[model samples]
Target: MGVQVVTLAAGDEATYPKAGQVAVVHYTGTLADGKVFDSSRTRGKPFRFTVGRGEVIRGWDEGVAQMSVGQRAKLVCSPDYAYGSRGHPGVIPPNATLTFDVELLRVE
Candidate 1:
């Protein structure tokens, strides 16, 4: 699996999203060892991006697209789907896998 989406909570199964749709999600990004790297929750505002767009990592798009509104999930991404060997400076290391606790708030 390129991105493994594990549902942690429920949501509206009837309303998911696809490419060109504006999706808003709250998330916590972490390394494989569970060290927090980033969080939309702490920022007090959710992140908004186009689903299946290149605005985020491939895994993020894939995972979020798999979720419906109000759903919470754990997305596990391998290096290729994430930052890969050239990771986010000062936040992630080279070739590191990443995990995201994601809450899909809106799919417009």
Candidate 2:
């Protein structure tokens, strides 16, 4: 089955999550072919990250803001905004398109 696509209005900004906030997020990182490379849903306990602390990728810094607690969204990031041309090494290829299914769990 294919993942459903969702669009956010341009300029929509999600509240920036602060440091030490433990949240349960259901996410999927995928390639342009719609193949899922990563998912927290299958792992059970979502993903946790501390904003502005460099725990996650940079695009997440800007993209996570475009969501609300309990919200679900699809975020697209280019190489420049993501891992850049080199990518995160093996997991993400160079110049490849990236997609994320982000769920905002909580700010704290």
Candidate 3:
């Protein structure tokens, strides 16, 4: 399974960033059971990364690429699009599916 992107708040599509461009975002992620795995909002810090640079998970790169600045979205990432069978220990479990609420803050 790959990733499914659900747009929550549509922003400026005209300003959408191209691949290899940097993006800043704030997000909260949870497991299928709804347990919080991580949250940039909780930490009060936005994350910055290159959109398609493999700096994040496969799903994130794909989903975030479709997002424009100020856009809010929900990303449903299957295990194949995330950590796969070897999930992140102490956070995600094996073959876990993740849900992330994301807000794109900026394109740099």
Q: On residues 52-108, what C-alpha lDDT tens digit does candidate 3 reach at each position?
A: 889999999998888888899999999999999999888789998899999999999
Q: Total backbone clashes of model 3?
A: 0
Q: What is candidate 1's lDDT per residue for 1-108, written digit by digit as tens?
A: 679999999889978878889999999999878899999999989999998878999998888899999999999998999988999899899998889999999887
Q: Candidate 3 — which residues are off by over 4 angstroms?
A: none
TM-score of each: 0.95, 0.75, 0.96
Q: What CA root-mean-square deviation does each model show from the true structure? A: 0.9, 5.7, 0.9
lDDT of each: 0.90, 0.67, 0.91
Query: Which candidate comes out best when scored by lDDT?
Result: 3
C-alpha lDDT (0 to 100) for residue 57 of candidate 1? 92
* lDDT at position 13, candidate 3: 80
* Residue range 1-108, candidate 2, lDDT tens digits: 112336433222465455455444668889888877788877777787766565666667666754567677787777766777786676888776689988777676
- Model 1 lDDT vs. the true structure? 0.90
For model 3, give the 10-residue run with minimal summed lDDT: 11-20
